Design an enzyme around this catalytic site. Structure first.
Site, PDB file in Angstrom:
ATOM      1  N   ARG A 287       0.851  -1.177   0.000  1.00  0.00           N
ATOM      2  CA  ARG A 287       0.000   0.000   0.000  1.00  0.00           C
ATOM      3  C   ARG A 287       0.909   1.257   0.000  1.00  0.00           C
ATOM      4  O   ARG A 287       2.122   1.136  -0.024  1.00  0.00           O
ATOM      5  CB  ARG A 287      -0.991  -0.019   1.171  1.00  0.00           C
ATOM      6  CG  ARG A 287      -2.405  -0.436   0.778  1.00  0.00           C
ATOM      7  CD  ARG A 287      -3.447   0.317   1.587  1.00  0.00           C
ATOM      8  NE  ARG A 287      -3.449   1.748   1.289  1.00  0.00           N
ATOM      9  CZ  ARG A 287      -3.940   2.686   2.100  1.00  0.00           C
ATOM     10  NH1 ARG A 287      -4.473   2.353   3.267  1.00  0.00           N
ATOM     11  NH2 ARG A 287      -3.887   3.963   1.748  1.00  0.00           N
TER      12      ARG A 287
ATOM     13  N   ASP B 142      -1.453  -1.094   9.448  1.00  0.00           N
ATOM     14  CA  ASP B 142      -0.631  -0.040   8.859  1.00  0.00           C
ATOM     15  C   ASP B 142       0.844  -0.174   9.182  1.00  0.00           C
ATOM     16  O   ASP B 142       1.689   0.086   8.325  1.00  0.00           O
ATOM     17  CB  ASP B 142      -1.114   1.341   9.314  1.00  0.00           C
ATOM     18  CG  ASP B 142      -2.444   1.722   8.714  1.00  0.00           C
ATOM     19  OD1 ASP B 142      -2.515   1.839   7.478  1.00  0.00           O
ATOM     20  OD2 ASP B 142      -3.423   1.907   9.478  1.00  0.00           O
TER      21      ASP B 142
ATOM     22  N   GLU C  55       0.840  13.693   5.173  1.00  0.00           N
ATOM     23  CA  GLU C  55       1.062  13.080   3.863  1.00  0.00           C
ATOM     24  C   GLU C  55       1.207  14.115   2.747  1.00  0.00           C
ATOM     25  O   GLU C  55       0.482  14.096   1.748  1.00  0.00           O
ATOM     26  CB  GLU C  55      -0.047  12.063   3.577  1.00  0.00           C
ATOM     27  CG  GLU C  55      -0.226  11.063   4.719  1.00  0.00           C
ATOM     28  CD  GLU C  55      -1.391  10.113   4.520  1.00  0.00           C
ATOM     29  OE1 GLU C  55      -2.415  10.498   3.912  1.00  0.00           O
ATOM     30  OE2 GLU C  55      -1.286   8.968   4.974  1.00  0.00           O
TER      31      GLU C  55
ATOM     32  N   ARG D 136      -2.788  16.795   3.590  1.00  0.00           N
ATOM     33  CA  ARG D 136      -4.081  16.276   3.995  1.00  0.00           C
ATOM     34  C   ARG D 136      -4.353  16.803   5.403  1.00  0.00           C
ATOM     35  O   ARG D 136      -3.494  16.688   6.286  1.00  0.00           O
ATOM     36  CB  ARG D 136      -4.057  14.736   3.937  1.00  0.00           C
ATOM     37  CG  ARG D 136      -5.002  13.995   4.885  1.00  0.00           C
ATOM     38  CD  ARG D 136      -4.796  12.479   4.776  1.00  0.00           C
ATOM     39  NE  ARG D 136      -5.594  11.745   5.752  1.00  0.00           N
ATOM     40  CZ  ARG D 136      -5.688  10.417   5.845  1.00  0.00           C
ATOM     41  NH1 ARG D 136      -5.031   9.617   5.023  1.00  0.00           N
ATOM     42  NH2 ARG D 136      -6.451   9.884   6.787  1.00  0.00           N
TER      43      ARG D 136
ATOM     44  N   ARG E 136     -13.367   6.151  -1.064  1.00  0.00           N
ATOM     45  CA  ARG E 136     -12.273   6.168  -2.031  1.00  0.00           C
ATOM     46  C   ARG E 136     -12.704   5.431  -3.302  1.00  0.00           C
ATOM     47  O   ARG E 136     -12.141   4.401  -3.677  1.00  0.00           O
ATOM     48  CB  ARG E 136     -11.011   5.585  -1.394  1.00  0.00           C
ATOM     49  CG  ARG E 136     -10.483   6.485  -0.303  1.00  0.00           C
ATOM     50  CD  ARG E 136      -9.622   5.760   0.690  1.00  0.00           C
ATOM     51  NE  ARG E 136      -9.010   6.696   1.637  1.00  0.00           N
ATOM     52  CZ  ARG E 136      -8.101   6.341   2.542  1.00  0.00           C
ATOM     53  NH1 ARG E 136      -7.712   5.063   2.608  1.00  0.00           N
ATOM     54  NH2 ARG E 136      -7.589   7.245   3.383  1.00  0.00           N
TER      55      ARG E 136
ATOM     56  N   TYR F 122      -5.032   6.580  -2.358  1.00  0.00           N
ATOM     57  CA  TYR F 122      -4.069   7.653  -2.260  1.00  0.00           C
ATOM     58  C   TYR F 122      -3.698   8.139  -3.658  1.00  0.00           C
ATOM     59  O   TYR F 122      -3.803   7.407  -4.644  1.00  0.00           O
ATOM     60  CB  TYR F 122      -2.824   7.155  -1.501  1.00  0.00           C
ATOM     61  CG  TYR F 122      -2.899   7.204   0.031  1.00  0.00           C
ATOM     62  CD1 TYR F 122      -4.120   7.095   0.704  1.00  0.00           C
ATOM     63  CD2 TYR F 122      -1.745   7.326   0.802  1.00  0.00           C
ATOM     64  CE1 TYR F 122      -4.195   7.128   2.106  1.00  0.00           C
ATOM     65  CE2 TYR F 122      -1.809   7.356   2.205  1.00  0.00           C
ATOM     66  CZ  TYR F 122      -3.041   7.256   2.849  1.00  0.00           C
ATOM     67  OH  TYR F 122      -3.131   7.295   4.236  1.00  0.00           O
TER      68      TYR F 122
HETATM   69  C1  LIG Z   1      -1.359   7.613  11.632  1.00  0.00           C
HETATM   70  C2  LIG Z   1      -2.366   8.554  10.991  1.00  0.00           C
HETATM   71  C3  LIG Z   1      -2.397   8.375   9.464  1.00  0.00           C
HETATM   72  C4  LIG Z   1      -3.628   9.123   8.960  1.00  0.00           C
HETATM   73  C5  LIG Z   1      -3.312  10.555   8.574  1.00  0.00           C
HETATM   74  O1  LIG Z   1      -2.548   6.970   9.119  1.00  0.00           O
HETATM   75  C6  LIG Z   1      -2.558   6.689   7.707  1.00  0.00           C
HETATM   76  C7  LIG Z   1      -3.999   6.507   7.293  1.00  0.00           C
HETATM   77  C8  LIG Z   1      -4.339   5.666   6.307  1.00  0.00           C
HETATM   78  C9  LIG Z   1      -5.533   5.942   5.547  1.00  0.00           C
HETATM   79  O2  LIG Z   1      -6.305   6.932   5.811  1.00  0.00           O
HETATM   80  O3  LIG Z   1      -5.665   5.155   4.598  1.00  0.00           O
HETATM   81  C10 LIG Z   1      -3.458   4.483   5.896  1.00  0.00           C
HETATM   82  C11 LIG Z   1      -1.981   4.896   6.130  1.00  0.00           C
HETATM   83  N1  LIG Z   1      -1.092   3.765   6.082  1.00  0.00           N
HETATM   84  C12 LIG Z   1      -1.830   5.378   7.551  1.00  0.00           C
HETATM   85  N2  LIG Z   1      -0.426   5.506   7.930  1.00  0.00           N
HETATM   86  C13 LIG Z   1      -0.027   4.966   9.090  1.00  0.00           C
HETATM   87  C14 LIG Z   1       1.407   5.038   9.405  1.00  0.00           C
HETATM   88  O4  LIG Z   1      -0.808   4.446   9.888  1.00  0.00           O
END
Ligand SMILES: CCC(CC)O[C@@H]1C=C(C(=O)O)C[C@H](N)[C@H]1NC(C)=O
Ligand SMILES: *[C@@H]1O[C@H](CO)[C@@H](O[C@@H]2O[C@H](CO)[C@@H](O[C@@H]3O[C@H](CO[C@H]4O[C@H](CO)[C@@H](O)[C@H](O)[C@@H]4O)[C@@H](O)[C@H](O[C@H]4O[C@H](CO)[C@@H](O)[C@H](O)[C@@H]4O)[C@@H]3O)[C@H](O)[C@H]2NC(C)=O)[C@H](O)[C@H]1NC(C)=O
Ligand SMILES: *[C@@H]1O[C@H](CO)[C@@H](O[C@@H]2O[C@H](CO)[C@@H](O[C@@H]3O[C@H](CO[C@H]4O[C@H](CO)[C@@H](O)[C@H](O)[C@@H]4O)[C@@H](O)[C@H](O[C@H]4O[C@H](CO)[C@@H](O)[C@H](O)[C@@H]4O)[C@@H]3O)[C@H](O)[C@H]2NC(C)=O)[C@H](O)[C@H]1NC(C)=O
Ligand SMILES: *[C@@H]1O[C@H](CO)[C@@H](O[C@@H]2O[C@H](CO)[C@@H](O[C@@H]3O[C@H](CO[C@H]4O[C@H](CO)[C@@H](O)[C@H](O)[C@@H]4O)[C@@H](O)[C@H](O[C@H]4O[C@H](CO)[C@@H](O)[C@H](O)[C@@H]4O)[C@@H]3O)[C@H](O)[C@H]2NC(C)=O)[C@H](O)[C@H]1NC(C)=O
Ligand SMILES: *[C@@H]1O[C@H](CO)[C@@H](O[C@@H]2O[C@H](CO)[C@@H](O[C@@H]3O[C@H](CO[C@H]4O[C@H](CO)[C@@H](O)[C@H](O)[C@@H]4O)[C@@H](O)[C@H](O[C@H]4O[C@H](CO)[C@@H](O)[C@H](O)[C@@H]4O)[C@@H]3O)[C@H](O)[C@H]2NC(C)=O)[C@H](O)[C@H]1NC(C)=O
Ligand SMILES: *[C@@H]1O[C@H](CO)[C@@H](O[C@@H]2O[C@H](CO)[C@@H](O)[C@H](O)[C@H]2NC(C)=O)[C@H](O)[C@H]1NC(C)=O
Ligand SMILES: *[C@@H]1O[C@H](CO)[C@@H](O[C@@H]2O[C@H](CO)[C@@H](O)[C@H](O)[C@H]2NC(C)=O)[C@H](O)[C@H]1NC(C)=O
Ligand SMILES: *[C@@H]1O[C@H](CO)[C@@H](O[C@@H]2O[C@H](CO)[C@@H](O)[C@H](O)[C@H]2NC(C)=O)[C@H](O)[C@H]1NC(C)=O
Ligand SMILES: *[C@@H]1O[C@H](CO)[C@@H](O[C@@H]2O[C@H](CO)[C@@H](O)[C@H](O)[C@H]2NC(C)=O)[C@H](O)[C@H]1NC(C)=O
Ligand SMILES: CCC(CC)O[C@@H]1C=C(C(=O)O)C[C@H](N)[C@H]1NC(C)=O
Ligand SMILES: CCC(CC)O[C@@H]1C=C(C(=O)O)C[C@H](N)[C@H]1NC(C)=O
Ligand SMILES: CCC(CC)O[C@@H]1C=C(C(=O)O)C[C@H](N)[C@H]1NC(C)=O
Ligand SMILES: *[C@@H]1O[C@H](CO)[C@@H](O)[C@H](O)[C@H]1NC(C)=O
Ligand SMILES: *[C@@H]1O[C@H](CO)[C@@H](O)[C@H](O)[C@H]1NC(C)=O
Ligand SMILES: *[C@@H]1O[C@H](CO)[C@@H](O)[C@H](O)[C@H]1NC(C)=O
Ligand SMILES: *[C@@H]1O[C@H](CO)[C@@H](O)[C@H](O)[C@H]1NC(C)=O
Ligand SMILES: [Ca+2]
Ligand SMILES: [Ca+2]
Ligand SMILES: [Ca+2]
Ligand SMILES: [Ca+2]
Lengths: 388, 388, 388, 388
Positions: free
Chosen positions: B37, B70, B196, B211, B290, B325
């Protein structure tokens, strides 16, 4: 291209940062991955490579049964770029059930030992060609480092051993220029039993931290003088000792010159390096088996055999997860030489009985002068679910 | 080799042309393909590479169960040339459950975060070696871009975040020369929650579109001054907003400085870039999940928060097909810098229950000053027929 | 690196020697091999590459069902070195259900068409980057060569077609410098329906031999003037005609300027080249289906539409074995330019009903001024035994 | 890059050290590995490559049934770096059921023969392109070395044979400059039946040791003069003879000029080289079948046909394990030219009936001026457990 000299100071190290991990066993439940053991890392001036000894089979393969054995005619040295798992397009660089590799700045040396226990042959391969070889001298399992050799100014050195694993053996240090054995010094100094050395450039020489398989749970040190070929030897002073088996921290002791005589029988390959008078060292967490893996600094640990003052501990693999061999490798920076270390994560027989095979994956950490936190990075394969 | 400066104007863009697609999940029904991912694209001066975070397993593999999580110690950053699917000869370039990569013109940087949630480590890897690392500062999931970083004149910048996903967090911008952290500026300006980031060179600086996971469905903008290290921040003015969830087009509103407070909770990684006073932007088609993916130009969309005048709409993935994403990457032409974007096509859990795994494929489009037509380019795997 | 000009005479050709064969379908009964069609060969100044259009699936894969379809969003252009079968480490160089590739001496061009039938997009990719694109002009399956384009002095040319397959269509010839469309000439001269051109450098211009899908079983010729962009067109005079379907040798006739009106409907991609006033040409052996493949010289076959004097016949694939598309590619020697040709060996649906898929392998022959004998080189897969 | 001349003396050889082993059949029980036979090794100035003739199938593949046959249209020459097993990303460098390869210092030549038994074609491929070809001259299985050719000063030589395997045949020696046949000398001197030559540079000429398939169990020698194209021929004097079948050591005899007429019918490909007046030579251990493999020196073995004084024997593959073809290759050192040899380890039909296929793995040893011990290095696959 110029020969490497490593004539730069060692990097400030405050601990280790995560560098690489191949998830080899996890991948091998849905992929064609080699069965290996005795893995290690070494790097050309540009980039790093992972080596291991194959069992001439893939994991999901009938021939993986009984891969617990150490020496078969089917074992070869595997070589990939670091982080590429040992798939079927992996190059076998030589035949070997014991090996050592290094790059002198121009080309790769490999030192590959194979053949009969009582009459093995070491092959010396440089720059894609065989340049030399030597017979076993003591006719009892001629063997070498299972980690990188070291070259300064185009003279590479490597430590080899022939003889008993649990008595006096015959250890030698070879000097190799372009694959050609140009000298052989025999082991000297206070180190009584020396195996699987983890060596690193310590300009103008080479330093190694080995495994005492006989009467020492402290680790031998070997000092190699590249120019005049002299050898000296002793042991890691630190009262917290790096071999496994060993005694617990409250009971253990050590000695700068002799084996400590504490659960000395057997061992595991491992590593240590000096930092002024302090020692950086890794070791299994569990005192008697290859479970967990930790690193720390022992203050005054290089000069003081009574010193048991650790700081900067890191758990690499948590105490409930299998570890295995570990060893040093050295990477040149802009201004300094870094120290990094790999850890063999062994899975399967004899210890794990859910499968018939014995394999490993690897995890790799590097010296850092920055900061770091915590975690655990085990093999992470489920042997209950794997190729039944 | 010289450092990249990106000191060329941005290409005329009339929309986007198809560039790449790996059919990763389709291939994985009859092949050994990694579960991934958080994919992304970045390019050395010659050619493009696709990165993603592996789950240390292949799809047709027992270890693909529960890959919805994750952060595991088995996740690594994958790297291939663009259009080579993540097969078993794929190099894992570091250990990472959060990452960012860029090439400065001489060598690759990787920024790889792994370890405990409450004490993670970021490793800084440049030119095949570990040069630095930092601990988590706020002890709550230190994380970074999941898309390319940006280097100007050999100073690379990257945005990292530690703290709450649904409250005030602690975002910082690091400056990195040859893998060495040479400065850290902390987040400043009106952006309230930043994650991100999708960054691109906007000579003499770097610009990012992030974001807001907290109270904004409009997207934050971060402006990075490479020479004096100053930071400013705000939001994408456009009345058609780029996050998901969001309100519908008739109900949505935005603000140049503050989060809009409209279904602000959660988000998806995404991107935008300026074109005079207009904004180019991609986003999911479905306002709450999504599903689908579209791009358009909003005229006056960069300066006017009341402006909802889109032109040049393109469907990338039709509204009945899953997206995920997306992020920017920048490619240097003869006379100008182009903008391209990738889209993560997520398949599996939690949303799709036919299988136990969670993976993705990718599709990649590039800025064009020519013309183009229409279509849809979904994942195209049949999860009813896949590895049962 | 300098641009290619091909300013050397064409090699003496006495016939063709065997060059390459990938056994793609045979390998795919015990391996992970891509489903393809519309394959072709093109070569950088050093070495040759095989391209094909993937169906975004491997053969032993649920997604190979119904790969008989021509345009899906999952088709990509595959690229390997010649003789490396399309395995899972094969690079997809762009998204495409119609394509053409060539190297100008410095870098690769790809011309990749994908998207909606009634509104497709052609992408122009040069040196690892997207430089241009054009929409469909006549909104009816914008399509191109399915074989190599040709570049002289850094101007590449390619023939594209939009419109009806069985009526008047709108064919154009693009001129491309570094991926940038610098001109478009529209089709001119006596060629009435032009598709899937097989082009080769004929200094100072480019010559192409195409497929008339409408009213001609003789093949169109297109002459491209690289410097002033003028176009001329006509047909291959030879009384033995190169399309399929066609009439038998005793009944067939041809015309230098017009379609012959003999089973003209439909066709197959193919090739021809001049040798003084004689023509070298390949074609299926079976007059009505894609069975067998032969090559011969027709003496006076380039200038005389009544001439049916063949010499130097070679069977490439025997008349009981399936063939398919074929096309030219040109390789530069020390003193001359050689002509080589590939043949698509199609297996599966609709013609073969034992399986659900449609795929191909390839066989490749090259011009020779030496001598040669005989044989047949079919696909050689057993579809009775394949992935059931 | 300069042409190779091999104008250096031959290395002191005291015997052979282990160099490479691919475990091809072992890997093929859990992997996608090609079915091969007639393997061989040749090396560019940097590094070594392993070649073999594929059967256009993988082992675990329905198409591996009946791979005992020698000439099919599906056989291709495989080429990897030495120690990379023939996986699916292996390049087929040409179509061939008989071949020979060499590098002249600038580029690779391949000599590839395929097509009808009674009218085969040899293709000459140099530097990624077809430069020449010749027909069969005697219309009876035109065939060549199945091991490396030799190039001096950019003139490569190769030995080919057309005609009877058990009567007088028509052997020729071609001279090739840049893939162009610049001369053909016909066989001359006392060698009566000549096949599968193992050639090596012996400055200023080339020397070959061949297989007499007709009336000789001693091996023919062929001497090729590169400058004036003259040929001479004779036999290996040594009273211990190198072909198989042969008589036992107590009964065997030989002759410097004629076939010995001792179980002369049939043979196996093999090798020998001069060392003053002594001969180094390998051969199967079992006198009548391809079981085991040994090497030794016969003192005076090059000049004295009565001499049966062997020293320095080495077992390569023990007498209970299958061997097969073997051949020489020559590697240039700093000061001398080394001699190395590969051994084809054949498994399957007709001899082994547990499976339907016929394949091979390889083991590779190199000349050494150091020392060595003992062992055995067989195939090591269990055909009872393999793909049923
Ligand atoms: C830790 C918060 C962050 C959201 C902004 O998580 C992301 C959300 C995700 C998401 O909204 O899909 C998946 C990403 N893999 C994740 N990253 C981690 C490291 O957990
Ligand atoms: C985030 O991650 C960082 C980096 O990993 C952690 O910081 C490290 O924490 C470890 C674990 O406690 C520290 O290592 C320990 O050092 C002790 C030193 O004692 C004191 O003395 C010095 C004086 O110089 C003081 O500075 C310091 O305050 C100490 O109080 C040793 O005694 C420890 O060894 C003992 O404990 C371990 C178990 O922890 C036993 O197994 C040993 O056998 C022995 O009894 C140990 O070496 C380390 O130094 C810290 N490093 C750095 C660089 O800061 C954080 O803890 C972590 N944060 C969270 C929330 O997890
Ligand atoms: C072949 O492919 C091309 C390229 O993709 C298509 O051309 C594009 O078509 C889209 C879809 O309609 C156009 O995007 C739309 O622009 C509208 C602008 O409105 C007018 O105003 C301008 C004045 O400057 C006029 O030039 C123009 O004539 C327009 O009439 C927007 O209003 C659209 O947004 C609205 O519609 C979409 C759904 O379509 C909604 O989802 C939105 O929320 C909103 O209500 C949209 O942005 C685009 O500009 C065209 N681009 C180009 C470059 O030409 C062809 O349509 C296609 N042909 C066929 C036969 O399929
Ligand atoms: C070993 O392999 C070589 C090379 O492939 C073969 O030699 C070729 O053989 C073919 C097949 O016969 C020849 O091609 C044919 O040429 C005929 C020409 O007729 C004569 O005229 C010339 C005058 O210039 C004379 O030199 C010559 O002697 C001929 O007699 C054509 O008529 C043929 O076409 C007709 O036959 C085919 C079927 O064969 C039909 O399908 C056609 O439709 C048509 O009726 C054909 O083109 C070729 O020229 C030869 N080439 C060379 C370079 O020599 C050997 O035959 C082969 N040997 C063996 C034992 O197999
Ligand atoms: C460790 O490994 C090394 C290297 O492989 C071994 O040393 C080799 O041993 C072999 C096997 O015996 C030797 O090869 C033999 O040489 C004999 C020569 O006879 C004598 O004459 C010379 C005079 O110049 C003396 O130097 C020497 O002492 C000898 O006594 C040949 O007669 C042999 O051929 C005969 O025996 C074989 C079976 O062994 C039969 O099959 C033959 O047909 C024939 O009857 C043979 O060639 C070799 O020379 C040694 N090489 C070197 C370099 O030393 C060690 O044996 C090994 N050690 C252990 C413990 O295994
Ligand atoms: C895996 O290998 C083991 C070890 O050889 C096998 O067990 C032996 O097999 C022999 C011969 O069949 C038996 O007679 C012995 O009882 C076993 N020997 C020992 C020392 O345990 C076993 O059969 C193999 N298992 C599989 C599934 O192949
Ligand atoms: C896939 O993983 C899930 C999640 O762990 C498994 O379901 C759990 O398994 C445990 C232990 O067996 C059970 O007690 C729980 O009921 C499950 N936990 C949760 C949170 O759901 C499941 O067994 C796995 N499935 C397969 C096919 O391996
Ligand atoms: C392969 O694909 C074909 C074509 O879609 C499938 O047959 C169709 O499936 C639908 C939906 O199940 C049926 O209602 C139709 O009768 C079929 N349509 C046509 C046009 O034939 C077939 O099911 C697939 N086979 C396999 C084994 O997956
Ligand atoms: C493997 O190939 C052999 C050899 O062709 C097959 O045996 C032949 O098959 C034919 C046609 O079915 C039979 O009529 C003959 O009796 C066999 N011929 C010979 C010469 O033996 C065999 O069927 C194949 N086996 C498998 C499992 O595919
Ligand atoms: C031969 C003694 C030596 C112990 C020091 O054996 C090593 C011990 C091993 C061990 O303790 O794990 C496994 C190593 N593969 C082995 N090497 C060889 C060649 O057998
Ligand atoms: C669209 C007309 C064109 C015929 C000239 O179709 C080609 C015919 C084909 C054929 O005759 O085999 C298969 C080709 N894949 C197809 N190309 C596309 C894009 O459909
Ligand atoms: C054609 C005679 C020749 C014997 C000298 O056959 C070789 C014998 C073989 C052998 O003795 O093993 C197998 C070789 N593949 C074969 N070559 C060909 C092309 O058939
Ligand atoms: C160490 O290892 C063994 C392995 O079985 C285990 O039984 C034991 O409990 C462990 N000991 C400690 C102190 O963790
Ligand atoms: C958006 O996504 C959800 C996903 O299940 C779906 O139920 C809903 O209908 C979609 N909404 C729109 C407006 O398309
Ligand atoms: C040509 O092809 C068809 C394919 O089924 C076949 O039926 C026919 O017999 C063939 N014709 C000739 C003349 O070979
Ligand atoms: C040689 O090979 C055959 C193969 O079956 C075997 O039967 C025979 O016993 C062997 N002979 C010797 C002398 O080893
Ligand atoms: Ca010990
Ligand atoms: Ca949000
Ligand atoms: Ca037609
Ligand atoms: Ca013989």
């Amino acid at each position: 291209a110029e020969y490497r000299n490593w004539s730069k100071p060692q990097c400030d190290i405050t601990g280790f940062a995560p560098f690489s991990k191949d998830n080899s066993i996890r991948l091998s439940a849905g992929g064609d991955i080699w069965v290996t053991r005795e893995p290690y890392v070494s790097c050309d001036p540009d980039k790093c490579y992972q080596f291991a000894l194959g069992q001439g089979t893939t994991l999901n393969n009938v021939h993986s049964n009984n891969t617990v054995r150490d020496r078969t005619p089917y074992r070869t040295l595997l070589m990939n770029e670091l982080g590429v798992p040992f798939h079927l397009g992996t190059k076998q660089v030589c035949i070997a059930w014991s090996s050592s590799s290094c790059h002198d700045g121009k080309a790769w040396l490999h030192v590959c030992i194979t053949g009969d226990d009582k009459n093995a042959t070491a092959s010396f391969i440089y720059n894609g060609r065989l340049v030399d070889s030597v017979v076993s001298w003591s006719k009892e399992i001629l063997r070498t480092q299972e980690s990188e050799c070291v070259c300064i100014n185009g003279t590479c050195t490597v430590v080899m051993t022939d003889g008993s694993a649990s008595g006096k053996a015959d250890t030698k240090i070879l000097f190799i220029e372009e694959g050609k054995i140009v000298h052989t010094s025999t082991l000297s100094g206070s180190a009584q039993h020396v195996e699987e050395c983890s060596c690193y450039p310590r300009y103008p020489g080479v330093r190694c931290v080995c495994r005492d398989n006989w009467k020492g749970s402290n680790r031998p040190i070997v000092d190699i003088n590249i120019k005049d070929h002299s050898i000296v030897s002793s042991y890691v002073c630190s009262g917290l000792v790096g071999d496994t088996p060993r005694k617990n921290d409250s009971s253990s002791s050590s000695h700068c010159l002799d084996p400590n005589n504490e659960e000395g029988g057997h061992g595991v390959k491992g590593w240590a390096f000096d930092d002024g008078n302090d020692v950086w060292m890794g070791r299994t967490i569990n005192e008697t088996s290859r479970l967990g893996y930790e690193t720390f600094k022992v203050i005054e640990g290089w000069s003081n055999p009574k010193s048991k003052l650790q700081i900067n501990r890191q758990v690499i693999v948590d105490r409930g997860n299998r570890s295995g061999y570990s060893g040093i490798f050295s990477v040149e920076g802009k201004s300094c030489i870094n120290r990094c270390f790999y850890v063999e994560l062994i899975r399967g027989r004899k210890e794990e009985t859910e499968v018939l095979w014995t394999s490993n994956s690897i995890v790799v950490f590097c010296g850092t002068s920055g900061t770091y936190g915590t975690g655990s990075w085990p093999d992470g394969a489920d042997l209950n679910l794997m190729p039944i």
